[PDB]
Design an enzyme around this catalytic site. Structure first.
Site, PDB file in Angstrom:
ATOM      1  CG  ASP A  35      -1.808   1.182   1.315  1.00  0.00           C
ATOM      2  OD1 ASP A  35      -1.934   1.895   0.304  1.00  0.00           O
ATOM      3  OD2 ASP A  35      -2.414   1.389   2.393  1.00  0.00           O
ATOM      4  CB  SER A 199      -2.238  14.279 -13.470  1.00  0.00           C
ATOM      5  OG  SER A 199      -2.655  14.012 -14.796  1.00  0.00           O
TER       6      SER A 199
END
Length: 330
Positions: A35, A199
């Site tokens: 994770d 992004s």
């Protein structure tokens, strides 16, 4: 040193991925959920409340000659999906894919929430976010990666998750045969303890690319892709009959649909998520309503590039002095 381990979807939907991890002496092999959105290595154990164990493999520290109680240390964690666990702490030898760390903090669960009990395939979590998020008190502990880093050939790990197939976690090297083209690196903020990056935009299907900054985290422990409501609405508007269902808890779509792809930007580069990666199947057995793999982050407080996004790429988690993230197509 290096390590290399195969990671395997837990079910036919890729709801999560498990990777075998050797703990203790002699080795006890547990299948952990790696994770990159958390920083605790915790396991089902001989200390876990018996009624809360249902099929998991447990770690038994009393059977490990290298286990030592970390005296006074406790841990307690709550995850974004509302699940939780807590317990006490041992140090022991932990190996992943041939890479060994001695003195790793292994957090032994005394209690786990129902979602963990109900998932027999996941024996615990191995956190790979920054150690500043580790929950051990009163002395915070380091992640497996943080402990291994100095010994690694290069201070990196990579995630290469498969679509409905096994993939690979590598430590200490970049497998140049595992991706196509070049790796595009992008800046990371560690301010919130995550692999947080921005992004450069998105496209839906064959549509034009929208240049827009989307701050979010690279999180292998989250199944879906969580993005701003504007972006998610633009995606689902291209699927006839798709709608946001408050009763189901997100966007659903007719199982008869063919889903468009979703592209996200990494600098000037582009990662394309095929439409099929966005299908999470019937909302309940036999239903013709299917659950979407792109969902709104509104009210999470952060955008999350979970497995839906990451499995479309070869992803480099660069833990150099100034960390960065790399993405390549594959």
């Amino acid at each position: 040193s290096t390590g290399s381990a195969t990671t395997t979807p837990i079910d036919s939907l890729d709801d999560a991925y498990i990777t075998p991890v050797q703990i203790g002496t002699p080795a006890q092999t547990l299948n952990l959920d790696f994770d990159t959105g958390s920083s605790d290595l915790w396991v089902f154990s001989s200390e876990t409340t018996a009624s809360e164990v249902d099929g998991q493999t447990i770690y038994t520290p009393s059977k490990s000659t290298t286990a030592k109680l970390l005296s006074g240390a406790t841990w307690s964690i709550s995850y974004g999906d509302g699940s939780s666990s807590s317990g006490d702490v041992y140090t022991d030898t932990v190996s992943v894919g041939g890479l060994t760390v001695t003195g790793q903090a292994v957090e032994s669960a005394k209690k786990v929430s129902s979602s963990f009990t109900e998932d027999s395939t996941i024996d615990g979590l191995l956190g790979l976010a920054f150690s500043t998020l580790n929950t051990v008190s009163p002395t915070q502990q380091k992640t497996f990666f943080d402990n291994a880093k100095a010994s690694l050939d290069s201070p990196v790990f990579t995630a290469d998750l498969g679509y409905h197939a096994p993939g690979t976690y590598n430590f200490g090297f970049i497998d140049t045969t595992a991706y196509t083209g070049s790796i595009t690196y992008t800046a990371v903020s560690t301010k919130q303890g995550f692999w947080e990056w921005t992004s450069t935009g998105y496209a839906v299907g064959s549509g034009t690319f929208k240049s827009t900054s989307i701050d979010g985290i690279a999180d292998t422990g989250t199944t879906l892709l969580y993005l701003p409501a504007t972006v998610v609405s633009a995606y689902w508007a291209q699927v006839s009959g798709a709608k946001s269902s408050s009763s189901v808890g997100g966007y659903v779509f007719p199982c008869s649909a063919t889903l468009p792809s979703f592209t996200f930007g990494v600098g000037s580069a582009r990662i394309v998520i095929p439409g099929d990666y966005i299908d999470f199947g019937p909302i309940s057995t036999g239903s013709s309503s299917c659950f979407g793999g792109i969902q709104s982050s509104a009210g999470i407080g952060i955008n999350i590039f979970g497995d839906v996004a990451l499995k479309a790429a070869f992803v480099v988690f660069n833990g150099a002095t100034t960390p960065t993230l790399g993405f390549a197509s594959k």
